[PDB]
């Protein structure tokens, strides 16, 4: 159970900034590696998001819930779908100025088939 | 000849039950469950066959009943339904269309009207060939129009609220006299065809 | 009547059906646990233990007349509401719960 | 090949093991899918609800970032070195299976970060954090069902395979094996009686003629 | 008459055994799987009966013991364990009630101390009734206190950890021989009951 | 003990119980999945193979000392804690293990 | 002496079969499912033996073949395949690892290619001692290389995809006449060894 109490973020810069101010993530004091990843839309390559994905899910283990923007999650669709674990939780929420889509939501796809 | 057979070793693998099923061309199942529910006899199309059937219906086809066409279409509706029930169990009702839901309703009617009896009236105690004929004619007639209308822009829920009076009437035919139209051809059915057609104009529109 | 009551037949249906369901419930309880079980299954369970331990169980020198038996039956069945008792005519069910 | 002489007794109990498993496991399966459905409708709504809240809090924060004429987010990244909103984990029995549940705590031993006092620009950040702490709490409390959901999704798939397997394979194997052995078995008893009767017939002939 | 019966072909379906059970009024089981595992003689309450029981427990009531009460509970612990074991094998353990776990645990104690004994109990040359009663009495008291303890609220794990010292002590009972109390009543087991009561006190609150 | 050892009969008794569980755990392993496994059983699955392929196996020409046999028994048993043992009196065990 | 026998009891436990099994030195089983797929003559290592194999394999080693090592490796590939095949059917292939996924696949190829000797050629029906050796060698080299490649980082699906054409070529090998190369030891089998080795480097990295 308890061995994890950070919420990590893959989101647009404003959303992330806000979330941190509110206090969820951190820049660790003995790894000196962020436990959040900011994204400049369209200006950041799809390959850099993927490294960061691996980082929160696997290369870190203190991540409880992994938050991820629908716009961003779609770009790296392959890696998200392949992640099916509950440790950390994958919870896709709408991106900033983007509406809900059931098909940018990895878990909802999974659930629908084989009900 | 109707012969009952029963286990002779406490199994159905007894020489007797298995020898007779070979000789016979009619097999009609019988269930504890349907008897407790008050359907007497207890025959289902999964635990039966009759190979004599082709010649009989043919014979019936001559007299006035449209019997052969109706009967094949009856067997199929009960078969297809069983399969549609298995989906309701696993997935639920969120993967079934209006047309599949309609199959279920028609099947429930066929079962209700024919299979369930108990001597409710002196109209269950005796039924002529004609009353049997009118019942199934009514169920198929509804089936084709209803499915057609959902294809053309309707809903099972819609079909249900409008159908109301005509649909309860076909379900209750078994308590009423068959002698309403003539003397053994039932009037409650003959009027139904016209109302069901009228029903369908309203339903599509 | 006169060595039975009229209400004898309806009751025979309630108790058999409820009991069967009680056995099925015992197996489910072991699996799900006590703190994750259904209401309907919980009732069926309670019935199993009382049914066994009161109706079937009687002492070596205790005579159980048929009139006596039928009363003990209504106490067991009472735990289910009227909503879950239905293989009983409402006439009876209103007399004796 | 399986033992011929009185396997019947063991093989009957195999059948009873199998049988008990179909009913019980089907009850268990039935219950998990009934729950699963309930969660489905909750999770679907909760995704839409989080999205609205996250976009509104994000836009108020964005407006502020632009008005002050400096990017607040840089200031914010140095100061973040703790997290106020954390989770504490619990395992909860939902049926026989343990699912992950989370209950959120806000540290009251954690002060406000210093990103205020910037002048007129500081007022703007000060109002901004207050809407956002409220907003962020939403995302986490709703998120507790998701983790339980994903697990529930995996376990039901395994429980579903097991019912199908016992039903199709296991039970008919117990029927066919039982039957094979029965057929040999009855014949050993019968032929014996015929052997006895044949020898006795010869005997009766000899004895009678005396 | 103690007459040993054993296979003459099948496991119990051989002629010899079938006839003997008809006529015998006392039967004491012996399971093969437990025999290979070394836990003989294994008496299984389903594969065992005594028709002499009722006159015998009333005899022991006159002699001093509460014996009839202990019999019912001994039976109950063994009995539920067999049914719960069948759910354990098929479904697995991911959950198994607080009460159900307790029954399993205590039934292991009964196996180890009683059922297993044949060159493994250093006193076995003649065991009095009182001593048997006293030993079983500790097992049953541990059981009732334990099930009450989970229900009035206290975790299953806290309850295992605190019972601790006494639990081992009942585990070790089997080696102990009359040397305390009377010549048939043993003080270590009498001491045990009171200490048990103190453990329950620590465990509930 | 004069041409064997006193533990010869005890060390044999332990190895049957563990081998028996390992065999049932294997059968269950196939049918249901790894869902019915428990800590003792996983250990028992390994024990089965270990025993089969080291203990029982030997060359045609090979012959074995009884005292040797008994050290190889102990070795296999060394992968289980002592609290899980019970077909050996705690006195006996302490000396040779 | 090579003698065919048959049941008439619909089991393999019948007198005729049993009395021959007692006496016989070499046993070549019959597996009905494989034969239903067609694989004349059909065998698994668990249903067949030759007590003579040991002394035969030393003799074959002198001749040229790598025969001993190939006999042990052949048994082992089939035996592992059988255990895993139960786990796949009931539980799923989800528990299994990619090396054991391979075990089923190499073993399948051996079923189709070896057992099937009905043919429509005398090359698909006659496989000389040398032709039998090359084939078996080629197939084991694949399995060993295959378990390593997935081990130092490659998939069952990825590995399967890269050999691809080269896998078809070994399947179709059997159709090809034995009269070429040195004698029945073709250059066709020798070049194939190099292509497996090359494929191994690709597969891993």
From Swiss-Prot, chain A:
Mind listing the UniProt keywords for this protein, alphabetically?
A: Hydrogen ion transport, Ion transport, Membrane, Transport, Vacuole
Recorded superkingdom: Eukaryota
Keyword Membrane applies: yes
Where is the major localization of this protein?
membrane
Gene Ontology molecular function:
proton-transporting ATPase activity, rotational mechanism
**Where does this polypeptide localize?**
Vacuole membrane
- Entries under InterPro entries matching the protein: ATPase_V1-cplx_f_g_su (IPR008218), ATPase_V1-cplx_fsu_euk (IPR005772), ATPase_V1_fsu_sf (IPR036906)
Question: Which Pfam families does the record associate with it?
Answer: ATP-synt_F
* Keyword Membrane on entry: yes
Mind listing the GO biological process terms from this record? endosomal lumen acidification; Golgi lumen acidification; proton transmembrane transport; vacuolar acidification
Per the record, membrane topology reads: Peripheral membrane protein
Q: Which GO terms describe its cellular component?
A: fungal-type vacuole membrane; Golgi membrane; membrane; proton-transporting V-type ATPase complex; vacuolar proton-transporting V-type ATPase complex; vacuolar proton-transporting V-type ATPase, V1 domain
PANTHER family, alphabetized: V-TYPE PROTON ATPASE SUBUNIT F (PTHR13861:SF2), VACUOLAR ATP SYNTHASE SUBUNIT F (PTHR13861)
Physiological role: Subunit of the V1 complex of vacuolar(H+)-ATPase (V-ATPase), a multisubunit enzyme composed of a peripheral complex (V1) that hydrolyzes ATP and a membrane integral complex (V0) that translocates protons. V-ATPase is responsible for acidifying and maintaining the pH of intracellular compartments.
Misc note? Present with 4050 molecules/cell in log phase SD medium.
- Family to which the UniProt record says this protein belongs: Belongs to the V-ATPase F subunit family.
UniProt name for this protein? V-type proton ATPase subunit F
Task: Give the source species.
Answer: Saccharomyces cerevisiae (strain ATCC 204508 / S288c) (Baker's yeast)
Swiss-Prot record, chains B, E, G:
Residue numbers bearing the Phosphoserine modification:
62
Recorded protein name is V-type proton ATPase catalytic subunit A, 2nd part
From Swiss-Prot, chains C, F:
* Whole-protein residues included: 389 to 485 of 517
Any further remarks?
Present with 131000 molecules/cell in log phase SD medium.
Quaternary assembly = V-ATPase is a heteromultimeric enzyme composed of a peripheral catalytic V1 complex (components A to H) attached to an integral membrane V0 proton pore complex (components: a, c, c', c'', d, e, f and VOA1). Interacts with RAV1 and RAV2 components of the RAVE complex, which are essential for the stability and assembly of V-ATPase.
Where in or outside the cell it occurs: the entry states:
Vacuole membrane
Family of this protein: Belongs to the ATPase alpha/beta chains family.
Q: In which organism is this protein found?
A: Saccharomyces cerevisiae (strain ATCC 204508 / S288c) (Baker's yeast)
Q: What does this protein do?
A: Non-catalytic subunit of the V1 complex of vacuolar(H+)-ATPase (V-ATPase), a multisubunit enzyme composed of a peripheral complex (V1) that hydrolyzes ATP and a membrane integral complex (V0) that translocates protons. V-ATPase is responsible for acidifying and maintaining the pH of intracellular compartments.
- Protein's name according to its UniProt entry: V-type proton ATPase subunit B
UniProtKB/Swiss-Prot annotation, chain D:
Role description: Subunit of the V1 complex of vacuolar(H+)-ATPase (V-ATPase), a multisubunit enzyme composed of a peripheral complex (V1) that hydrolyzes ATP and a membrane integral complex (V0) that translocates protons. V-ATPase is responsible for acidifying and maintaining the pH of intracellular compartments.
Which cellular components does GO assign to this protein? fungal-type vacuole membrane; Golgi membrane; membrane raft; proton-transporting V-type ATPase complex; vacuolar proton-transporting V-type ATPase complex; vacuolar proton-transporting V-type ATPase, V1 domain
Encoded by which gene?
Answer: VMA8
Q: What else is known?
A: Present with 8500 molecules/cell in log phase SD medium.
| One GO BP annotation of this record | Golgi lumen acidification
The topology of this chain with respect to the membrane is:
Peripheral membrane protein
Q: Where in the cell is it found?
A: Vacuole membrane
Q: Which key words are in the record?
A: Hydrogen ion transport, Ion transport, Membrane, Transport, Vacuole
Q: What is the annotated quaternary arrangement, including any partners?
A: V-ATPase is a heteromultimeric enzyme composed of a peripheral catalytic V1 complex (components A to H) attached to an integral membrane V0 proton pore complex (components: a, c, c', c'', d, e, f and VOA1). Interacts with RAV1 and RAV2 components of the RAVE complex, which are essential for the stability and assembly of V-ATPase.
Protein name as catalogued: V-type proton ATPase subunit D
Family named by the database record? Belongs to the V-ATPase D subunit family.
Q: Does the keyword Transport apply?
A: yes
Named from the GO MF annotations, one term is: proton-transporting ATPase activity, rotational mechanism
């Amino acid at each position: 159970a308890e061995k994890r109490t950070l919420i990590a973020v893959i989101a647009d810069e404003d959303t992330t900034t806000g979330l941190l101010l509110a206090g969820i993530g951190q820049i660790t004091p003995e790894t000196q590696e962020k436990n959040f990843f900011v994204y400049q839309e369209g200006k950041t390559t799809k390959e850099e998001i993927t490294d960061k994905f691996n980082h929160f899910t696997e290369e870190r283990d203190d991540i409880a819930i992994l938050l991820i923007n629908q716009h961003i999650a779609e770009n790296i669709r392959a890696r998200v779908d392949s992640f099916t674990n509950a440790f950390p939780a994958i919870l896709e929420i709408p991106s900033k100025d983007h509406p809900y889509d059931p098909e940018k939501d990895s878990v909802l796809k999974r659930v629908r088939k084989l009900f | 000849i109707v012969a009952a057979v029963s286990p002779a070793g406490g199994d159905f693998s007894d020489p007797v039950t298995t020898a007779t099923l070979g000789i016979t061309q009619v097999f009609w199942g019988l269930d504890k469950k349907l008897a407790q529910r008050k359907h007497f006899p207890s025959i289902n199309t999964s635990v039966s066959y009759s190979k004599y059937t082709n010649v009989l219906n043919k014979f019936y086809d001559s007299n006035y009943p449209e019997f052969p066409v109706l009967r094949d279409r009856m067997k199929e509706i009960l078969s297809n339904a069983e399969e549609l029930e298995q989906v309701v169990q696993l997935v639920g009702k969120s993967a079934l269309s209006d047309s599949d839901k309609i199959t279920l309703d028609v099947a429930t009617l066929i079962k209700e009207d024919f299979l369930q009896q108990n001597g409710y009236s002196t109209y269950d105690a005796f039924c002529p060939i004609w009353k049997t004929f009118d019942m199934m004619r009514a169920f198929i007639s509804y089936h084709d129009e209803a499915q057609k209308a959902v294809a053309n822009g309707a809903n099972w829920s819609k079909l249900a609220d409008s159908t109301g009076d005509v649909k309860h009437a076909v379900s209750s035919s078994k308590f009423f006299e068959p002698s309403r139209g003539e003397k053994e051809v039932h009037g409650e059915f003959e009027k139904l065809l016209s109302t069901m057609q009228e029903r369908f104009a309203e339903s599509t529109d | 009547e006169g060595m039975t009551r009229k209400d004898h037949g309806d009751v025979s249906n309630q108790l058999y059906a409820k009991y069967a369901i009680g056995k099925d419930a015992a197996a489910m309880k072991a699996v799900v646990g006590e703190e994750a079980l259904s209401i309907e299954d919980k009732l069926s369970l309670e019935f199993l233990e009382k049914f066994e331990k009161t109706f079937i169980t009687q002492g070596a020198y205790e005579d159980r007349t048929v009139f006596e038996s039928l009363d003990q039956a209504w106490s067991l069945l009472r735990i289910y509401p009227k909503e879950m008792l239905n293989r009983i005519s409402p006439k009876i069910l209103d007399e004796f719960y | 090949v399986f033992p011929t002489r009185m396997t019947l007794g063991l093989m009957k109990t195999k059948l009873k093991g199998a049988n008990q498993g179909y009913s019980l496991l089907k009850r268990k399966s039935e219950a998990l899918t009934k729950r699963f459905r309930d969660i489905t409708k909750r999770i679907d709504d909760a995704k839409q609800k989080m999205g609205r809240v996250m976009q509104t809090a994000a836009f108020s924060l964005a407006e502020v970032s632009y008005a002050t004429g400096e990017n607040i987010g840089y200031q914010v990244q140095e100061s973040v070195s703790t997290a106020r909103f954390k989770v504490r984990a619990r395992q909860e029995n939902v049926s026989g299976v343990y699912l992950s549940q989370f209950e959120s705590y806000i540290d009251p031993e954690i002060n406000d970060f210093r990103l205020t006092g910037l002048g007129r620009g500081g007022q703007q950040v000060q109002r901004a954090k207050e809407i956002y702490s409220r907003a962020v709490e939403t995302l986490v409390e709703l998120a507790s069902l998701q983790t339980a959901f994903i697990i529930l999704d995996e376990v039901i798939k395994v429980t579903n395979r097991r019912v199908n397997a016992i039903e199709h394979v296991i039970i008919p194997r117990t029927e066919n094996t039982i039957a094979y052995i029965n057929s040999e078995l009855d014949e050993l008893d019968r032929e014996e009686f015929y052997r006895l009767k044949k020898v006795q017939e010869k005997k009766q002939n000899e004895t009678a003629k005396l």
